[PDB]
Design a protein around this ligand. Structure first.
Ligand SMILES: Nc1ncnc2c1ncn2[C@@H]1O[C@H](COP(=O)(O)OP(=O)(O)O)[C@@H](O)[C@H]1O
Ligand SMILES: Nc1ncnc2c1ncn2[C@@H]1O[C@H](COP(=O)(O)OP(=O)(O)O)[C@@H](O)[C@H]1O
Ligand SMILES: Nc1ncnc2c1ncn2[C@@H]1O[C@H](COP(=O)(O)OP(=O)(O)O)[C@@H](O)[C@H]1O
Ligand SMILES: Nc1ncnc2c1ncn2[C@@H]1O[C@H](COP(=O)(O)OP(=O)(O)O)[C@@H](O)[C@H]1O
Ligand SMILES: Nc1ncnc2c1ncn2[C@@H]1O[C@H](COP(=O)(O)OP(=O)(O)O)[C@@H](O)[C@H]1O
Ligand code: BEF
Ligand code: BEF
Ligand code: BEF
Ligand code: BEF
Ligand SMILES: [Mg+2]
Ligand SMILES: [Mg+2]
Ligand SMILES: [Mg+2]
Lengths: 298, 282, 262, 293, 279, 236
């Protein structure tokens, strides 16, 4: 058992040496959680990349990140003016949610970690709660640490019964360290830990935990202006302006969500590429030139 | 296994000394339960700064927390006139059942130990029952003690058929050491140990545990006066805006929880604060 | 292990003498569970007007050990005083009252999960009379749990050694029917009747005065539903009420010193 | 409790050596899928054995299977001109939905990985997700990779909150690894992993899974020409008689699937051999007759 | 735990030793179905015993068993002349829909493996799919492999929106392992394993499973002479009293489906038996 | 074989049964056909095996009619009559707890039966026999070189909606009419065998007093008028 745990420890120590740069002491449980500390330089989508929703970026930055990072600015107010306990981005499926949980991990600089729901559920008994305590132990040892759990309605969410007698503890031993008797320091700082969460079913997330994460922003499907921005941003790397008429495309795709505009642009961005390939299919060898032309998709 | 256990017992010694002094020995096995003894001065809350709850904040101070400390003035009776062995603290989420426990831990005087859920369920076989036993063996060593299992719905609960019976042995261990044949003392005192619970749904905690906790304090949602008090109480750091009328936001809450009110009042203190972004501008 | 065997020797001497014989180290560790008869303060008189199941015990269990069936069950639900009955039996029993403390059987080893099970019956064979009462018997008698269960049921039916089995499960009809059928007897403990609830009123009300409240007789009018534990907690509350009033009055001024009246 | 690991780990390397030698190190749960990759030389069918699907075989080849391999060809706007992260083959049961994926596992070149729904659902707690992030970690190691979940509407479905919670995490684990936070690289390349899915019932898969896989190819029943071509493809094992209108069978079918036609051809072809057996002969005989019905 | 698995391995080894010669490695899943491979000599019924449905027993002996065993004579065809991978025989309750399975298991070398519904339904999550997979992993390892799912309309069935979780991924996994990715071999052989489905109503079995059982032999009620055939065959070694014949009873037995005749005749068989007790 | 050991709690022993064959109420023709064709061939088959492969006892026998105790009494009695250990279904055990727990029970029942002597299985209040249990109960009753040597009995008030395929496999379906104007005399004699019968009138109006009820009022009248002249003898 030690032969595997040593390599594990070496890997997480390497990851944390890469992250911490601009050497902790770790037990075995939150050791393997150190593999989930996302390096902020490995998420190539900032806040200037996601168009459409902008006010949600406003209320997501100037009330969550400025409270977490640079807390001295929010000390004149007192104990109230701190970062909220947790955040939730609920809305229709496939519009900016997981991609807005990337810019918050790239520019925030708050020791972001992706929780990886599988790791919460361990096979041995009493090791699915050791990891739930470890995710907060490591979160506070390198605070201010943002935590993220995508799809929070399976690992979290309404119990409705004693499922398996091991899923009611991760739902409870998470809530015990979240906003429990040790959530506040001896002076008042609540450890500076904000757990995000993405979900399209807000009404299945254990409303007792709904009190836990109050900053719950609705992430609606993009409107007409939001789509006119998402087309401009998704169609950056495309020699697409012979006689391009984006006003028609941003209007016709009204009912379409914000994640299908990407695939629509993809089909409308490799159509002339397929034309060039089928043209070159006559003879020769694939040594692709840079002369397709995007005009109109479907 | 021993060196790491030696570090565990060393940290346990430090925490126990800082709790006691405000000297004893252990078995090198129950040290991992004294690593949750909450100190008295670190909990920054008290019974004075919790508006709303009044009959609870008085009934706890008179009936449970303070027949325990200074029990000499209740020594006229036998088993009676003693600390009631058990408390529940049930209520909806976000109404001050954890803050109440924090204030109890800070203003009690008994050796408050915070028994987590991850400290009872153990991987090795037979290493989860001897921790539930270590808890009640430590509570009796120094026995002003308020054990506190927060969120008693997973660690405890209605024992159903099967469901990892090794996890049912823990609840059986609680049932047998809590009020079993050796519950009280040979002199008659019931060891002066009062577990404090916490939950949002009193429907599956237990029927064989409700008897084991005679007190059940219902903490409901704050009404008119409770919200009027909590709104004034939360605004102790944030300076009051000039001409700001409190009763409007006080009455407009109208049944909202005791934490959502805190968030809506935090927004009203960050609103102007966020607005003054001029320092970088200038 | 040396400290373990030393404490074992001391506790077993204080149990037996009211001598001692050295035995296996994996069998001494269960010998630290022998509570002396003078350790329990309560007695038979501390039980209410039950005097039927306690009478059955007094006639059928303690007498033969002075044949004695091996196995006795406590059937009542939580609230009637199963553990209280067991504690009272342990006082006026005169035999060797040895509990189990199932955590003692549970061990993080492979070949040691059966040695303690052997050691319990071995020590029972060493000294008589003996008592192996195990509260919450529907906890351990549900490759380790099954092994310990099978080995316990193997040596369960070990003069028939003067060994007695007493069970106090909080719930029945879902409890070890393989061995529950083997045990001879089982005594149900129902809710308190009229005379039973009257005795419960008269017993717990021992230290408090007779006029701290309305009256004792009227309390035995709605307490029919509640059990012996809810009645005791309500009595504790009603007793603390007058002392509550007195302490609240004394809060006005004066050092918080004890008194000699409510 | 250790020999099972040794057996799977030794066979895990041996299975990978086959696909590797056709042209690495894995942890515990990755050995499960390590015994699960399909070598393209093993499957005996190719793209030229699926008739009538000239508009689906051509769109499963220009936009989903050949932006993926040789991605250097698509590097002008590579951030967007990549292979889709999944494909949904849906339609009437019995036409190509498994044959297309069987030929894609043969004539693609990518490390095709079948998913085998029984292996995702372990009886222990948490192994169902340890296998999901094992397959979505082996695909990244065997990149480029192609995952195929035949009949996706069984292992995946609408959440249905009042059901088994342990099976709502594997359905909520694809939404975390297959398009989650780490679906992209440090520069934009989304791991070059496409997940194939063939369901006989679309719209009962999910409201969120139907956006991950952006290429839902509907595979209709064989029309007037699909039957004509499937007859040609199927009746190439035994010789044909000098005169029989094979158009007649296709011209009269008009309502059968791609499997019903194969079964009818099987029933028709057995007539001459069963007649030769009616002649009570023991040895073989290379002549027969494939007359209509 | 381990001892139970070792005992199951001992049973499977004994059963394979007794069934193979009129032995291969097995896990603890396909071992569970190892106890289901019946011995041909156990079933005391042959093809000659079945009557009435004489034109269904013929097409099963020429298009299923012959294309399954000794296919070298059928090797002249490439792949079309293999055995049909699935066979269904439906009928009203009271006809020969199960006795045909016995005749196929007894007088046709097939490694007949009947799987019971309780051998598929299980308590642990993902333990039923790993048995549906073990079945087809065993049938491949010994592959005459005539699998027989009687009352298939229950173990399978119509898949709905509000369908049970565990019972919904065992219908899809089964029909995916039947005709799926690994259905064929490297050489292109169809991997001969036939599945016998014997249901009472082919209306709700599935829309995708009926194609997986292309041979659907209808088993109607016993015909006029067919009932006479069953009468003459069921009372071969029975009582032989004077001239009174079942042919008159055959005309009398207009209804009284084929299963019912086997008890009608036995009830009529106590005529000389009852008087023997009169001593 | 954990389930067959679990079902071993309901295997009533073939001996020490309350059968007492004469105690059953007045029922001759049904019991005549029973003792002639079912229980008789169960014992000493060597004297009944003159014809082979067909003289096995059919495992289908139904007792349909209003609810009562005679059908259950007859089921209890036939076991001791043929030296059979009564293994009741215990239909409340058919409730579902796990996914396939009940199907395991249905398998283990026939497992123990085939492993056991010719005792007969009983299904009290047959109404459950539409999932895997209902499927597998029709399968393992008759399925894949010796007869079953065990008969299944049918006891249920429900008729013509009881899965007629199961009705097909129930050859000797016997109507069990509990209310009988002649069986009532015998059952009242059975009752009054021990009860003191000095003051009460002759057993003639009893044949018309409990005319409506089938077999329950007669069973409750064992002590209905028994203690009526008995309270005074007990109080004084
Ligand atoms: N507002 C947006 N601006 C730009 N791209 C978007 C936006 N919303 C969705 N997308 C596209 O959707 C893809 C990821 O979708 P995602 O936001 O993860 O869905 P969900 O909202 O369910 O998390 C990205 O590739 C991105 O291009
Ligand atoms: N009675 C109260 N007065 C003031 N604030 C309260 C009160 N109850 C709860 N809160 C606020 O709620 C937060 C913690 O709530 P918590 O005690 O966890 O709710 P619950 O006890 O219902 O779980 C604290 O930050 C505190 O400010
Ligand atoms: N028969 C009785 N008469 C009077 N009081 C009783 C009786 N039984 C129980 N009690 C009271 O109720 C309480 C029951 O507590 P306990 O014996 O621990 O319950 P249990 O035995 O169910 O664990 C005792 O403290 C005792 O004072
Ligand atoms: N376009 C086609 N050309 C040739 N054969 C086909 C075609 N479509 C289906 N088939 C036949 O169908 C059989 C497999 O059907 P499959 O596609 O697996 O059905 P499903 O889509 O329900 O999985 C193969 O044996 C093949 O001969
Ligand atoms: N021709 C026949 N000869 C002998 N037995 C028959 C014949 N037809 C039906 N049976 C009997 O009828 C019973 C029921 O038929 P079966 O095929 O099992 O239908 P099901 O599967 O619906 O029960 C069988 O057990 C069989 O013994
Ligand atoms: F598609 Be996202 F991850 F909800
Ligand atoms: F939020 Be408390 F701990 F219920
Ligand atoms: F109710 Be106690 F556990 F006997
Ligand atoms: F494989 Be098919 F789509 F059932
Ligand atoms: Mg709280
Ligand atoms: Mg007790
Ligand atoms: Mg398929």
């Amino acid at each position: 058992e030690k032969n595997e745990r040593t390599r594990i420890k070496a890997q997480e120590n390497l990851r944390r040496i890469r992250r911490k740069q601009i050497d902790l002491v770790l037990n075995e449980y939150e050791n393997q959680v150190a593999l989930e500390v996302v390096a902020p330089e490995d998420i190539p989508v900032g806040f200037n990349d996601i168009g459409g929703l902008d006010d949600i970026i406003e209320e997501l930055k100037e009330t969550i990140i400025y409270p977490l990072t640079m807390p001295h600015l929010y000390k004149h107010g007192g104990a109230l003016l701190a970062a909220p306990s947790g955040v939730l981005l609920y809305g229709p499926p496939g519009c900016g949610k997981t991609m807005l949980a990337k810019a918050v991990a790239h520019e925030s600089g708050a020791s972001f970690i992706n929780l990886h729901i599988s790791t919460l559920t361990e096979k041995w008994y009493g090791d699915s709660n050791k990891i739930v305590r470890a995710v907060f132990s490591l979160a506070k040892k390198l605070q201010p640490s943002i935590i993220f759990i995508d799809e929070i309605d399976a690992v979290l969410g309404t119990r409705r019964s004693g499922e398996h007698e091991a899923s009611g503890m991760v739902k409870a031993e998470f809530m015990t360290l979240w906003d429990g008797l040790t959530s506040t320091n001896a002076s008042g700082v609540p450890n500076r830990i904000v757990v995000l969460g993405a979900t399209n079913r807000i009404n299945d997330i254990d409303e007792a935990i709904l009190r836990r994460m109050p900053k719950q922003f609705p992430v609606p499907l993009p409107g007409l202006e939001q789509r006119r921005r998402i087309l401009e941003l998704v169609l950056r790397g495309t020699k697409r302006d012979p006689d391009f008429d984006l006003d028609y495309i941003a209007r016709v795709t009204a009912g379409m969500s914000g994640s299908d505009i990407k695939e629509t642009c993809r089909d409308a961005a490799m159509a002339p590429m397929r034309e060039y390939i089928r043209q070159h299919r006559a003879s020769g060898k694939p040594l692709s030139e840079i002369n397709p032309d995007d005009v109109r998709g479907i």
